[PDB]
Design a protein around this ligand. Structure first.
Ligand SMILES: Nc1nc2c(ncn2[C@H]2C[C@H](O)[C@@H](COP(=O)(O)OP(=O)(O)OP(=O)(O)O)O2)c(=O)[nH]1
Ligand SMILES: [Zn+2]
Lengths: 431, 381
DNA sequence: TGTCGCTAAGTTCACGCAGTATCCTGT
């Protein structure tokens, strides 16, 4: 009722980049090449056996994460030697470690501990005293290098916190120099109103897709939300798989006129899918022979290449997860986004939030960020935004539905080699 | 015959009588297999008992030469080896192996001493030779019927017995184990001088034993009951009594006190045994113990065994080891066998036909017929 | 019928020495 009678349909709630006309048109995915970013590491494309984590394996994965990031930072900063975190230090020493909270609550400036890696510290921890640090921004699981002293052997006092070093951007090949600008419409779940299971917002978005004919449509989960009031109280008369199959059929068949490449990203809130992160792609739907080349069932997180433009995307609410734990000396979202980019992982928070199941071997294998993406799609319960963080266009399109009321989606234009202005324009628009 | 005259006659014989052409035909086996004659082992025994082995020759000419040069007292034929025996020193250790040889049997009258009464040790007479006459028939029949060996050369050993050379290609490729199996199959009289009962047949008579007893029966009456007279007096028939269960022994003794002829005593023994049934084969066990051939399994088991060559000269009797015609076996007489002295007298009394003028000719003829059969088998095959 | 020398690393085979395994003999 409330959604159907909305009056702000099509309103542009946020804008960035070159001004464009009131109407956006795309190439219908004609001269479009969508693939997974070809990096050294193989992508997650199939289910991996889970529910069996050895504490030793978790220890090894965390330790190697710290060690690898510290090695890269040491080469970049020309640091001579790292020192064990636990040992006393009367003079200033450089220490590599990861941040954490001394208790189970939320991190605060008086509860910070630094845990070293196995190579340099035997995994030992030390309390941290942030009284002598003038400026800082710390979240649990953050790999840091600090110059400080430990006079009592019991409390590390940092004096310098080395800044993060983001990965270099992608240097596109000339193969896509002559390709036109590409239009991407991105939306995130939930796709149905809190009190309905009819997917009205999804129908409106599909109508928008057919109207504007974008080159890529990135749909992020959930598609059958686990927190939907109907799902939790067991009022559904059909199986979860059937509802999800109906939703996917609606999406794929309804986009036939647009000829738009669909990129489907699962969510941890998908009640019908495996609850593990990194999430494998959906595998319960077989597109018809006429839609096989258009539909891309990708994994969470995903690094996509679109005519040379690298788009990073994750369904996980990274900003909400890290905002609850980040502590700063004095834009918060920009700081968190820079933290994500500099840590070079799509989920650097450790321990994770209570709402995400992390398989740490898969996390090690499939969460490293190959490069710094040209566009980074990070849907969040927080407010929509389009930010420029260290040259990367971070887009939060919100969620298509916000409770009983309609939500928002985003549309942006990407061209490889433009001007670094790989993102010509971007807009958060209302549904 | 004067054995001091042996060194005088040996050369002439080896020069003008020893049948070298047929000998090479034999040991060369139609040239089918290369190096067959060239890998054959020979051994020579010279004057003053000097023994040499690992002698091999390239062809008939070399053999004739080295033999006429050495003038050996004994010639033994051995195995065909993997290489030439003459170069056995040159062959790497373990790589010198005996590979093929005729299957051979040696039957020696001396092994019958505990059961013959006319002679002893190396003495033979017409009364005991029938034992050999039996053996050749008993064995050769088996070799022609049970095993299917088709080329069999029987040769007089010169003094105490006979040898058999079974030369079928199959018989020449038999392993040691197969040879031992063949020997044990043919062998019935088992035991030494310390055993009295050497034959213990089972309830079932194996067909081979039935056919050997059938062959024995034809001769038994003449050999044992007429000639040998194995029941002449108590000192001898005590043995045969010793070969049967004690239960009837007394019953027999009184009967043997009223019998005048050993044929009568045999009839009485057979009747008494028949009256007494598991012992129904006891007379057969006695016949076998007095008539069946004795075989030294060591002679036939080993591939590397050196056996007296045909047409050798016996160092003591001087007789020639002549082949025996199977058909005319009943006419064979080991005392009429040509001696070397007789055939040298015959030779010095008148090129490739000199031997046809001696008494050696019919035996070379039998050998030539045997070699002709071997050639027919080599061709037809 | 004469075909220069020695020195040295290297391959392929033939054997010691020791260790592991499986397969035997008879009536
Ligand atoms: N018998 C013999 N000896 C040789 C041969 N080649 C080399 N040599 C020996 C004897 C030479 O004096 C010695 C020196 O060898 P070199 O290859 O250094 O050449 P050489 O010193 O004669 O002259 P060079 O180094 O070119 O100024 O090696 C050869 O072919 N036969
Ligand atoms: Zn006699």
């Amino acid at each position: 009722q409330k959604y159907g009678s909305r009056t702000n349909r099509g309103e542009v709630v946020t804008t960035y980049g070159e001004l464009q006309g009131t109407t956006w048109n795309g190439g219908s995915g004609s001269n479009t090449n969508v693939e997974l970013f070809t990096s050294l590491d193989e992508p997650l494309t199939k289910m991996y056996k889970f529910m069996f984590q050895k504490l030793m394996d978790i220890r090894e994965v965390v330790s190697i994460k710290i060690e690898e990031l510290g090695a890269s930072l040491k080469d970049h900063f020309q640091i001579d030697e790292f020192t064990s975190v636990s040992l006393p230090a009367q003079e200033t020493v450089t220490v590599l470690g990861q941040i954490g909270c001394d208790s189970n609550g939320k991190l605060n400036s008086k509860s910070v501990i630094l845990e070293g890696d196995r190579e340099h510290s035997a995994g030992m921890q030390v309390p941290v005293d942030l009284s002598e640090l003038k400026d800082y921004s710390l979240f649990p699981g953050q790999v840091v290098i600090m110059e400080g002293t430990n006079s009592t052997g019991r409390r590390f006092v940092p004096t310098k916190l080395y800044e993060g070093v983001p990965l270099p951007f992608h240097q596109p090949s000339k193969e896509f120099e002559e390709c036109p600008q590409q239009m991407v419409i991105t939306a995130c779940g939930p796709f149905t109103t809190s009190d309905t299971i009819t997917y009205d917002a999804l129908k409106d978005l599909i109508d928008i897709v057919n109207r504007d004919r974008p080159d890529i449509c990135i749909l992020l989960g959930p598609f059958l939300d686990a927190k939907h009031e109907q799902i939790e109280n067991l009022q559904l008369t059909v199986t979860f798989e059937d509802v999800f199959k109906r939703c996917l059929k609606m999406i794929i068949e309804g986009t036939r006129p647009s000829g738009c490449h669909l990129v489907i990203v699962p969510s941890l809130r998908d009640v019908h899918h495996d609850p593990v992160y990194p999430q494998p792609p959906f595998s319960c739907f077989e597109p018809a022979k006429e839609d096989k080349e258009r539909v891309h069932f990708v994994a969470d997180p995903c690094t996509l290449s679109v005519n040379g433009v690298v788009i990073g995307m994750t369904s996980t609410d990274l900003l909400f997860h890290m905002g609850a734990e980040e502590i700063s000396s004095s834009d918060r979202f920009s700081r968190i986004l820079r933290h994500i980019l500099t840590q070079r992982s799509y989920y650097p928070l450790y321990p994770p939030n209570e709402e995400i199941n992390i398989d740490y071997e898969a996390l090690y294998s499939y969460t490293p960020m190959p490069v710094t993406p040209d566009v980074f799609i990070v849907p969040s319960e927080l407010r929509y935004f389009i930010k420029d963080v260290t040259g990367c266009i971070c887009i939060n399109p919100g969620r298509l539905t916000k409770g009983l009321v309609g939500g928002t989606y985003a549309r942006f234009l990407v061209k490889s080699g433009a001007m670094r202005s790989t993102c010509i324009s971007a807009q958060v628009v209302r549904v | 015959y004067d054995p001091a005259s042996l060194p005088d006659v040996l050369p002439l014989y080896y020069r003008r009588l020893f049948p070298f052409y047929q000998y090479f035909r034999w040991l060369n086996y139609g040239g089918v297999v290369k190096n067959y004659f060239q890998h054959r082992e020979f051994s020579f025994t010279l004057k003053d008992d000097v023994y040499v082995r690992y002698q091999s020759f390239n062809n008939q000419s070399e053999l004739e030469k080295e033999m006429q040069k050495m003038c050996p007292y004994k010639i033994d034929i051995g195995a065909v080896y993997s290489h030439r025996p003459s170069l056995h020193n040159t062959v790497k250790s373990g790589t010198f192996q005996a590979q093929e040889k005729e299957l051979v049997f040696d039957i020696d009258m001396t092994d019958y001493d505990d059961v013959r009464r006319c002679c002893s040790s190396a003495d033979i007479c017409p009364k005991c030779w029938t034992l050999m006459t039996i053996a050749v028939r008993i064995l050769d029949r088996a070799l022609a019927e049970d095993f299917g060996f088709k080329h069999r050369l029987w040769v007089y050993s010169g003094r105490r017995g006979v040898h058999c050379w079974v030369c079928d290609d199959s018989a020449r490729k038999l392993s040691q184990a197969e040879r031992s199996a063949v020997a044990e199959y043919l062998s019935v009289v088992k035991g030494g001088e310390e055993t009295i009962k050497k034959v213990q047949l089972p309830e079932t008579i194996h067909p081979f034993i039935g056919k050997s007893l059938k062959m024995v029966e034809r001769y038994f009456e003449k050999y044992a009951l007429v000639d040998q007279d194995i029941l002449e007096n108590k000192q001898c028939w005590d043995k045969v009594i010793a070969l049967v269960p004690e239960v009837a022994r007394e019953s027999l003794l009184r009967e043997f006190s009223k019998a005048r002829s050993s044929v009568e005593r045999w009839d009485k023994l057979s009747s008494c045994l028949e009256a007494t049934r598991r012992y129904s084969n006891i007379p057969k066990e006695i016949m076998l113990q007095f008539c069946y051939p004795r075989l030294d399994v060591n002679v036939s088991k080993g591939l590397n065994h050196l056996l007296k060559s045909p047409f050798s000269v016996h160092p003591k009797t001087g007789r020639i080891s002549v082949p025996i015609d199977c058909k005319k076996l009943d006419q064979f007489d080991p005392f009429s066998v040509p001696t070397i002295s007789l055939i040298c007298s015959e030779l010095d009394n008148v090129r490739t036909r000199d031997y046809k003028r001696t008494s050696l000719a019919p035996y070379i003829k039998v050998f030539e017929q045997f070699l002709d059969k071997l050639d027919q088998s080599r061709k037809g095959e």
